[PDB]
Ligand binder design. Structure first.
Ligand SMILES: [Mg+2]
Ligand SMILES: [Mg+2]
Lengths: 33, 128, 126, 32
């Protein structure tokens, strides 16, 4: 119920999901040429 | 009021070292905006990294923070376009221009992390 | 109606090959839509290539083509997000997403040059 | 007649000096 926890839950959940793509940050955008 | 940049959301959604400090700042300001192109950018970076279950967590974060997704109108693109002459590249990339544009037309401070928005004519939300 | 990506303006303004076919296209149908963010990508590319005098010519082109600069609405951003998992990285860029977005939503064909933007869900302009 | 103008603009714009010739991608900040 308090937003601060709600976002921590979301973060920790999302954070803890598998890395289907370790191509990091800028190559995802099609911008490594 | 605030505006948020993808650099921030992605920091939070990827459990980056600072992440807690951004939550505290998001929590402290109850009115929040994001450009649809900065929302779109996160989406691609999250969904690529974690799959659509990541996307799901993005959509849920946005829903609870009640974040305003603001259309990228002509006026913002201009300010962005103009700024980049001054602050592009040691500065902004094409993607940063969207959060940049919204902050200046809104006149609202920008929550980001990293270097790209360090030295620019728009205010910043500082961390607590 | 039509949509014009950054590829077909950065092309024309730089007098790349077949720029006159892109002019005929611009001529052939009267209302020409362009995404405020494709325009922006176009505005940066021009003004680094040719400086601010590049921008004058860019600005003249857009006013003399009577272009309607359409806002990136949320619905456009969701079609791009949606479509990127299939067609993103040949590929499809972040910059391309706004031309895709506007097109998929507006339902209009898309003027462009380069490999990307072939083999996607939306129509290509001949 | 519309066609003339976009040729005039194209020719007139194309004939500007090239102040940066780097790739489109790189000047959008996507090359570090
Ligand atoms: Mg950004
Ligand atoms: Mg494009």
């Amino acid at each position: 119920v308090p937003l601060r926890d709600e976002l921590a839950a979301i973060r920790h959940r999302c954070a803890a999901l598998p890395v289907v793509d370790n191509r990091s940050a800028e190559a995802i955008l099609g911008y490594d040429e | 009021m605030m505006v948020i940049d993808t650099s921030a959301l992605v920091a939070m959604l990827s459990d980056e070292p600072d992440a807690e400090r951004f939550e505290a700042a998001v929590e402290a300001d109850h009115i929040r905006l994001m450009s649809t192109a900065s929302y779109l950018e996160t989406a691609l970076v999250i969904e690529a990294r974690f799959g659509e279950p990541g996307g799901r967590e993005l959509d849920l974060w946005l829903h609870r923070a009640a974040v305003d997704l603001v259309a990228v109108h002509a006026d913002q693109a201009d300010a962005a376009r103009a700024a980049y002459r001054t602050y592009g590249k040691a500065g902004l990339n094409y993607g940063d221009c969207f959060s940049y544009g919204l902050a200046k037309i809104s006149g609202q401070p920008l929550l980001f992390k990293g270097e790209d928005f360090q030295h620019t004519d728009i205010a910043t939300v500082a961390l607590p």
